[PDB]
Structure 1
Amino acid sequence: AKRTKKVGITGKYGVRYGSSLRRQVKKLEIQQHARYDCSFCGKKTVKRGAAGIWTCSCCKKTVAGGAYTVSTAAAATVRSTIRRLREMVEA
C-alpha cells in the first residue's frame, strides 16, 4: 500500500542522523536511483553506475555527468553559452 508518509527512501536510515540531513539526502537519493532518458535511443534505461558515470543498458553507451543527476544545471548553462559563441565565431 502506502507505507510511509514522508521519509521515503530514507526510512532505511531509521531514526538516526537528524530529520534535516535525512531530508537533504532524500532529494538526492531519489535523483540518483531514478531511470533517465538516453539521448541516443530515447529509452528509460539510464542509471548511475558510479559518481558521474551514467550508462544505458539498452544501447550500451555511457555519458559523463553530475554525481547525482545526469545533467546538472551548471553544465546546462555552459552548453548554451558554448553554442552561442561557437555559432558566432564561424559566422
Structure 2
Amino acid sequence: AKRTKKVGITGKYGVRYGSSLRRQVKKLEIQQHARYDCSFCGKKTVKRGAAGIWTCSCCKKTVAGGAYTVSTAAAATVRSTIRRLREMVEA
C-alpha cells in the first residue's frame, strides 16, 4: 500500500530542512541502515552502528569500512592498486 511517494525513510523529518537536503540524507541513510553481504560466511548480515564499523550478525566478524557503506569506491580502488603493486614484487 505504497505509503509515501518519494521521501521514504526521510518522512520522519517531515517538512523541515529543505527537499534537497532531505534527499542527500535519504541516500546515505538508505546505505547505512541497510544490511550487507558477509565477505566471510556469505549470509547477508553485515550492519553498521558507529560510522566505519561493519560487524556481522552470525559469524561475528567486524570490518573497518566506509562511513555509511561497507566499502568506499576509493578504498576498493586502493585494494586493486595494492594487489597490482604487490604482484610486481614477486613475479
| TM-score normalised according to structure 1 size | 0.98
* C-alpha distance after superposition, 1:25-78 (max 9, x if no partner): 010000000000001010011100210000001111100010100000000110
Q: Which runs of 5+ in 2 are unaligned?
A: none
* Secondary structure of the corresponding residue to residue 12 of structure 1: helix
How many angstroms apart in 1 are the aligned matches of 2:61 and 2:3? 36
* Secondary structure of the corresponding residue to residue 89 of structure 2: helix
* Secondary structure of the corresponding residue to residue 54 of structure 1: strand
| TM-score normalised according to structure 2 size | 0.98
Q: Which runs of 5+ in 1 are unaligned?
A: none
Equivalenced residue count is: 91
How many angstroms apart in 2 are the aligned matches of 1:62 and 1:49? 11
- Deviation at residue 90 of structure 1 after TM alignment: 1.1
How many angstroms apart in 1 are the aligned matches of 2:29 and 2:69? 10
* Secondary structure of the corresponding residue to residue 44 of structure 2: coil
How many angstroms apart in 2 are the aligned matches of 1:59 and 1:2? 35
**Corresponding residue for residue 80 of structure 1:** 80
